[PDB]
Amino acid sequence: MKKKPFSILFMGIEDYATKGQKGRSDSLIVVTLDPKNKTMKMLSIPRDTRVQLAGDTTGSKTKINAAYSKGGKDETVETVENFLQIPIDKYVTVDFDGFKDVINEVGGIDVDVPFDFDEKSDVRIYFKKGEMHLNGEEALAYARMRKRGDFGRNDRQKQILNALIDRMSSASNIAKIDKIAEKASENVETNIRITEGLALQQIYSGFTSKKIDTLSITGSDLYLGPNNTYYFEPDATNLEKVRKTLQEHLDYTP
């Protein structure tokens, strides 16, 4: 794998196929990587972010999570590219079953639970504030809990991804890493190859998620129509700064 800076879009979905098309995405996280300098940046995109869908020149803006339901992963990737004004080099898609499999193959994940709460199992699951080691079913319930936006959900999703990054960065047995990466990636849709993932693990060996520069799409709650359809309207000057920051990290000029 070349050491050129590159980006990954992580898509979390429920249904790969429904309603004659695809399902809406629930989780959208972009990571940019500068391997020559061992750096990373991370940005989640709220599911209700009001955007123009890629290729929809004559249409009205809609929620970004509808992109996957209106053209699949290709439409989501291109819509995110247009929104962030960066190329999306790699993608990872996971549905609920695939996500649980990933978590179980790495032997669970460590997260700092913010408060006590119990959720239903997709198969009661109790979470106590403080450190917890979750299996796949528990990690899915953690990611899905909702208690008018999805901000806490996005926070917990980024927590899960940070924990996965920390697990891969702290691993050492490269042959063990090879087999764990083969097993854990069997049920995700991706254009990242096993060799690329092993190279990335080697480059970021000893990295830690605290070092990731986490950016934010700031904006406002917006209720459109007499039915008060909820949208997250992105702040334009913040979005311009996020764009410039990701572009600089990627050595990409629009």
Side-chain angles (χ1 to χ4, degrees), residues 1-46 48-119 121-123 125-127 129-145 149-182 184-247 249-254:
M1 192 193 61
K2 313 210 160 176
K3 303 257 198 303
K4 183 176 156 255
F6 73 101
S7 58
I8 311 172
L9 171 63
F10 293 88
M11 291 163 280
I13 67 174
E14 178 170 355
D15 299 307
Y16 277 113
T18 189
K19 272 157 274 294
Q21 284 176 295
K22 320 251 162 195
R24 300 167 87 94
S25 59
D26 296 300
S27 181
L28 292 175
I29 301 167
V30 170
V31 174
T32 55
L33 299 91
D34 184 359
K36 270 155 191 150
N37 290 311
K38 296 166 135 50
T39 58
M40 291 194 206
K41 304 197 185 294
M42 182 181 299
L43 169 77
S44 60
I45 307 166
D48 302 294
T49 306
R50 185 164 169 262
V51 301
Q52 192 77 38
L53 296 185
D56 186 15
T57 58
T58 56
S60 54
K61 289 171 170 174
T62 190
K63 302 180 188 198
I64 192 164
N65 68 351
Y68 203 93
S69 76
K70 297 189 182 308
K73 70 170 173 309
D74 292 352
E75 182 65 22
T76 297
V77 167
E78 211 190 359
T79 298
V80 169
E81 285 180 325
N82 288 356
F83 182 63
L84 298 178
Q85 286 293 289
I86 58 155
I88 290 302
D89 304 290
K90 298 295 191 177
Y91 59 87
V92 174
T93 309
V94 75
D95 72 347
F96 288 177
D97 185 78
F99 172 80
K100 288 190 307 185
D101 188 57
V102 171
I103 301 299
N104 281 331
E105 288 288 0
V106 304
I109 213 60
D110 298 279
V111 296
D112 196 0
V113 176
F115 53 86
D116 288 51
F117 73 94
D118 53 298
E119 271 296 279
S121 163
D122 69 319
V123 179
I125 299 178
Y126 304 106
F127 302 90
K129 173 172 156 63
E131 147 72 16
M132 283 191 78
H133 194 93
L134 312 176
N135 61 30
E137 159 189 45
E138 296 166 339
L140 181 63
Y142 190 74
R144 290 175 73 198
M145 186 269 283
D150 63 339
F151 187 80
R153 260 178 168 176
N154 273 240
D155 197 291
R156 285 176 257 108
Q157 290 157 16
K158 279 186 287 178
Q159 231 179 348
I160 289 156
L161 183 56
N162 284 341
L164 288 166
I165 291 168
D166 286 335
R167 170 77 65 77
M168 92 163 205
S169 295
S170 63
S172 38
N173 193 10
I174 303 108
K176 171 178 304 137
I177 291 150
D178 191 332
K179 297 243 48 172
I180 302 273
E182 288 201 340
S185 58
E186 259 301 287
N187 290 306
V188 317
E189 195 183 21
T190 186
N191 69 333
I192 302 178
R193 273 131 181 210
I194 286 300
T195 50
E196 294 175 321
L198 298 180
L200 277 168
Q201 194 284 333
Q202 191 277 331
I203 290 163
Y204 287 94
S205 177
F207 187 75
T208 191
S209 67
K210 180 169 168 37
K211 288 172 180 175
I212 300 167
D213 182 16
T214 301
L215 311 184
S216 298
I217 303 294
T218 62
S220 307
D221 292 346
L222 172 67
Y223 296 88
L224 293 185
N227 298 13
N228 293 310
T229 311
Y230 172 82
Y231 293 88
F232 186 64
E233 178 71 10
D235 184 290
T237 57
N238 173 264
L239 178 60
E240 279 310 318
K241 182 63 169 179
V242 167
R243 288 174 170 171
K244 269 196 278 289
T245 300
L246 295 180
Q247 288 161 1
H249 193 227
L250 294 169
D251 297 331
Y252 173 86
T253 77

